[model samples]
Target: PTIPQGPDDDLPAPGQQFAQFGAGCFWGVELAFQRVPGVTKTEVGYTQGLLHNPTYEDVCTGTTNHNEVVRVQYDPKECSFDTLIDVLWARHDPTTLNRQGNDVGTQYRSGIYYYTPEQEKAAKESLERQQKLLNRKIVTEILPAKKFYRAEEYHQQYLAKGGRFGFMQSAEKGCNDPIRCYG
Candidate 1:
């Protein structure tokens, strides 16, 4: 369980690969990845659902069974895959575990998608450590990469793009600013 730190140091073991994950709403989740040090680029999209190309509306109904995910492009040289794994949990980083219950909207399952076998092993190992850190069962789902459907242009980076009123939350790399979430 390492807290997400800014890239105070640059590394050279670089592979510009990716990690896809989501905890709650994709908007807030997207912003979290934006601040991650090793992350170079990010996009919000839908995946792990039964339907192909499900929309925000279709997803909200909870019938399509798709998850709103943020696919993160990161440099392993700057950020280790394990480091990226920790960042996912840091978004819901609260003292109290078991944050999930009813009343959670179309939040989808707290999910993680790995592109390679190495990523999968790292994630599962980190997940074990994370679970031990908390007293409750972590309901996060870990799956292999699926066919990703990019969200609508508006849905992408809605928070950093100023939401609806140009209240541009900083998408700047290595920032620790509070993410302004949209409904």
Candidate 2:
């Protein structure tokens, strides 16, 4: 299969940093990242899977082991890694294990894909802090980011691109309005 890729898939600007997360459906999470001050770009994709280039159908079958993920490119000066970490926990139920809402499978499992050593430390430390806030265990996995096979164009910025009724979601930073996962 031809490896489908986005315009800037796996590419980053000088000094720009990358972070990936799988917290349920990526549509909602990508919008959440877009609202962060330091985030420069957000793309939805499939990652941490065994397949070389897994598509949405391949992932949904639960055979590829690919997690539906969103990769965020951020400027650390304006956004702290800690801030992104906070959003990861707020956006989903980390204690539910391999599932989020109606979505059920390993592809929907909550995970953090750190790009650097600092991110590794920050993510791990934040997990500890986040656990204290929840009564149940936080099952989010913290791992290294490997190949990020960008999802179909339809999946990128899905909510912001007039999802559901084609209602545009304001993704500007500080536009923290509630997101509709179904949309």
Candidate 3:
């Protein structure tokens, strides 16, 4: 599939960094990052899967082992990786395995895909910190980013859909508004 670039397509400048997280549906996860002050770009995609080029329907089968993930490009100066890590922990429950809210499946599993050693350390440390907060084990996976297959264009900024699902004017309001597309 041809991946179309969205508005948040600024290539990382010097000192910029990338981070990927799989915390349930990419729509909500993308919104969660979209609201962040430092995030410059966000994309939803399938990763950590066996298939080379999988589609949204292909992933829905739950046989591909593909995780619906959000790839974020941000300026570390504007937003620290640790800060993104904090968002990941707070936005979803890491203690739940292969699930977030009502979403359930391996695609909904929790993960942290780091781009650098510092990020790896920070992810692990944050996991340990979060472990202290809950009685159950933190099931989030901290791994180095592998092949990141971009999702289809329709899934991009789904919450900001202009009229896709009859949610009129949501696109005009944008994803960062107080009345957000996702909770």
Candidate 4:
């Protein structure tokens, strides 16, 4: 349920397109969105919860039914929702449910939280198209977006700013390819 950064952040004007997703760690999720060329802004937070201003520990404990989601505030004028879907699939192992890497629980589950009817349709079509390309089903859920509660100040831009939470340096050495510490 990560909200976009900045002081003036708000809804997209009349026709702009936006999308939300709850994957595993927003730290890693931010990296995925930032990698994409058309992404305007990416923020990490918690979403789909009734609690107001819930803490990370509250969400992690699974008491809020909240998921760790990265909201992608992008300019659909440059890239379509389909393209965002492609980026989403490319960034993580969607095949795994309720987990990403060592992270686990309902908070880490793969999901597409849509912002509009067009986005919902596009996400469905994207999943359908992706499913045809794969032999197994894509377990990612397509759900209507709920209120996004911004995480604590320390959780903002964690990887880039290197907040104390879960930042780790990756070292590539040994074997045919180098290993990423955070990967």
lDDT (C-alpha) at residue 148 in model 2: 85
Candidate 2 residue 99 Cα shift, in angstroms, is: 0.5
Q: Which regions of candidate 2 deviate over 4 angstroms? A: 1-9
Per TM-score, the best of the predicted structures is: 2
Reference-based TM-score, model 3: 0.83
Give the per-residue lDDT digits (tens) of candidate 4, residues 27-104: 767666665666777778887765567789899898777789887777777767887888788667777888888888
Clashing pairs in model 2, backbone N/Cα/C closer than 3 A: none
TM-score of each: 0.81, 0.93, 0.83, 0.79
Note the Cα lDDT for every prediction shown.
Answer: 0.72, 0.87, 0.79, 0.71
Please give the lDDT score at residue 7 for candidate 1. Answer: 14
lDDT of 2: 0.87
Sorted on lDDT, best first, the list reads 2, 3, 1, 4
lDDT of 2 by residue, 1-183 (tens): 223222225668888988899999999989999999989989999887777777788998998778898988899889999999999988899999889998999999999988788999999999999999999999999987878888999888889889888788989988878988956
lDDT of 3 by residue, 28-132 (tens): 677778778888888899888777678899899998888899998898878999989987887788888898888889999999987778999999998888899
Residue 133 in candidate 3, Cα distance off native in Å? 1.2
Residue-by-residue lDDT tens digits, candidate 1, 3-38: 111111222235678788867678888988888887
The Cα error of candidate 2 at residue 140, in Å, is 0.4
Name the best candidate (by lDDT).
2
lDDT of 2 at 154: 81
